[PDB]
C-alpha cells in the first residue's frame, strides 16, 4: 500500500482559493483546552491515502 499521500481530512475552517497550508496543528471540534495535543475531541491534522 503506497500510503504516502495526505488529504487534510478536516481543516480548521474553509479554504480561500489558491491557498496552501502545511500546518499540522491538532484540530479541535469540541472544547478548546487541547493545545497541540490530540485529546478526546481533538484529532490529528491530515489523513493518509490508500
Amino acid at each position: 500500500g503506497n500510503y504516502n499521500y495526505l488529504y487534510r481530512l478536516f481543516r480548521k475552517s474553509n479554504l480561500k482559493p489558491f491557498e496552501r497550508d502545511i500546518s499540522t496543528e491538532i484540530y479541535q471540534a469540541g472544547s478548546t483546552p487541547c493545545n497541540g495535543v490530540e485529546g478526546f475531541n481533538c484529532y490529528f491534522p491530515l489523513q493518509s491515502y490508500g
Partner: antibody, heavy 129, light 108 residues
Framework: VQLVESGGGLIQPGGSLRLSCAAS????????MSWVRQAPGKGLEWVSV???????YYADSVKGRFTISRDKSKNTLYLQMNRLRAEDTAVYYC?????????????????????????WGQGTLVTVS | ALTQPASVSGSPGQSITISCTGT?????????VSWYQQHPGKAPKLMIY???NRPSGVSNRFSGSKSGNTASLTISGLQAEDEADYYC??????????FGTGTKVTVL
C-alpha cells in the same frame, strides 16, 4: 484488513522485548492503533494506544517500561517492553480503532472519535520467566 | 475499572441481560461504550459500539444500552454459538482505556 504479529516468546524478568504488528489494508497513521493483552485464561487489559500522530499514551501498569512506536515506511506497529515482570505474562493483541465514518450511519460526519475496536491481530505469547 | 458478572446462563430461545457498572467519568459521562465477543482461542469480535448501535454483519438479536453509570448488553434468542465471554469496553476518559472483567455465557 489484516494484522499479523510477531516477536513474543520466552524471556527473563528485567530484560527487553520488542513486539511487531504489521498491518495490511490500512496504516498505523490512518486510524488509532492500540495494544491490548490478555493474561492466560483471564480478562482483557488495555496496554497502550497511539493516536494517528503524536500520542504516546500507556497504562499505569506499564508506564515508564513500555513504549509504543511505528514505522510508516514498513507500515508496522511496534511495542517496546523494557524491564519485564512476572505479571506481564499474557498474549498481546494489536487492535486498530474505528476508521472515520464507521459503517457510515448517515447522520454524523467525519468526527474521528468513533471510539471502539475494529479487527484485531492474531496475538503472540509473552512469557516472562 | 469496569465490573462484570463472572458468568451468566440461560436456555435457548429467551433473552439474557448483562450488566457493567462503572464510574460517571467514562460510562456515565461519555457515550462510546462498546461490547465484544471472544471465543476460546479466537480474537475478540466487535459486538456493540456507539451504545445503541450495532455493527452490520452481526445477528440483529444483539442489543445494548446504558442507564447512567451502568451498561447493558441485552442478548435475545440465545443459540448454541453464543457460548463465549463478553467484555464491555467503555470510553477511556482521557486515553486510559478500560475493559470489564468478562461474562462467560453458558447456553443450556
Amino acid at each position: 484488513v489484516q494484522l499479523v504479529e510477531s516477536g513474543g516468546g520466552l524471556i527473563q524478568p528485567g530484560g527487553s522485548l520488542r513486539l511487531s504488528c504489521a498491518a495490511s489494508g490500512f496504516t498505523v497513521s490512518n486510524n488509532y492503533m492500540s495494544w491490548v493483552r490478555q493474561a492466560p485464561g483471564k480478562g482483557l487489559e488495555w496496554v497502550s494506544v497511539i493516536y494517528s500522530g503524536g500520542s504516546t499514551y500507556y497504562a499505569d501498569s506499564v508506564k515508564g517500561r513500555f513504549t509504543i512506536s511505528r514505522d510508516k515506511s514498513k507500515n508496522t506497529l511496534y511495542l517496546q517492553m523494557n524491564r519485564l515482570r512476572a505479571e506481564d505474562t499474557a498474549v498481546y493483541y494489536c487492535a486498530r480503532e474505528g476508521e472515520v465514518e464507521g459503517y457510515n450511519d448517515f447522520w454524523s460526519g467525519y468526527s474521528r472519535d468513533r471510539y471502539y475496536f475494529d479487527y484485531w491481530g492474531q496475538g503472540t505469547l509473552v512469557t516472562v520467566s | 475499572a469496569l465490573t462484570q458478572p463472572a458468568s451468566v446462563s440461560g436456555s435457548p430461545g429467551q433473552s439474557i441481560t448483562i450488566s457493567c457498572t462503572g464510574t460517571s467519568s467514562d460510562v456515565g459521562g461519555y457515550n462510546y461504550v462498546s461490547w465484544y465477543q471472544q471465543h476460546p482461542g479466537k480474537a475478540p469480535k466487535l459486538m456493540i459500539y456507539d451504545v445503541s448501535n450495532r455493527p452490520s454483519g452481526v445477528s440483529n438479536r444483539f442489543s445494548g444500552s446504558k442507564s447512567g453509570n451502568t451498561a447493558s448488553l441485552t442478548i435475545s434468542g440465545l443459540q448454541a454459538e453464543d457460548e463465549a465471554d463478553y467484555y464491555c469496553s467503555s470510553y477511556t476518559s482521557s486515553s486510559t482505556r478500560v475493559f470489564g472483567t468478562g461474562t462467560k455465557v453458558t447456553v443450556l
